[PDB]
Amino acid sequence: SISSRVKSKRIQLGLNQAELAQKVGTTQQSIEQLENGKTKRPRFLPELASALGVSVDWLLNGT
Amino acid sequence: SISSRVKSKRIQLGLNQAELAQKVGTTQQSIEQLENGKTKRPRFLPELASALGVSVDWLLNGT
DNA sequence: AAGTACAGTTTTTCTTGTAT
DNA sequence: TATACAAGAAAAACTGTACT
Q: Which residue intervals define the domain HTH cro/C1-type in the entry (chains A, B)?
C-alpha cells in the first residue's frame, strides 16, 4: 500500500504531514489525500520519493 | 525536455506511439500529448522509463 | 493504409478553505 | 498544533475521428 508506505516512512523520518509537504514542495492537504487513499498517483511522486530516501518503485509496488 | 527525451528513445527503439502506449499501459493519444508537450507530468512516468529502458530522473531531468 | 494529431467529454489530482 | 473533510478548478486521461 502506497498510503501506508508514505505514512510509515514519514512518521519514521519523524516528519509531519505539513513538514513533508514542504520538502516535497506541496501542501499538507496533498500529503493527507495521499496518506488517506484519495490519490493513487500524485504528480509529486518523484520529489516525494526523493524526500523519503526511497524509490518511486518502492512506493508504487513496494519492491 | 521530457517530451524530447520520450520522442527520441521512442524512435531510437523503433516503437510507434501506439506500441509504446501498449507497453506502458496508456493510449497513443496520451503519448502524443506528453511528446507534443501537452502533458507536464504523466502518470505512466514510471512504466514509461521502464519501457524506454531509462530512469525517471533522466527522463524528467535528462543529463 | 498506417501513424499521428485533434476534439469533446470524463476522471483524477490540486488547491484553498475550514472543521474535527 | 496536527490531521481530515469538501467543493471547485485544473491537469490529464479516455473515446472518437481526422489529417498526412
A: 6-59
Give the C-alpha separation, B57 to B46, whole Å.
Answer: 10
Q: Can you give the CATH number for the domain in which B40 is found?
A: 1.10.260.40
- Structure-determination approach: X-ray
Number of domains in chain A: 1
* Range of the structural domain that residue B55 is part of: 1-63
SS3 B55: coil
**Hey, are the CB atoms on A56 and B46 less than 8 Å from each other?**
yes
Chain A interface includes B15 (CB < 8 A): no
Residue B37 phi/psi, 5-degree rounding, is 80, 20
Return phi, psi of residue A26, to 5°. -125, -160
Half-sphere exposure of A11 (CA within 13 A, CB side): 8
Distance of CA A55 to the CA centre of its chain: 11
Closest nucleotide to B31: CA versus each C1': C4
Resolution for this experimental structure (Å): 2.5
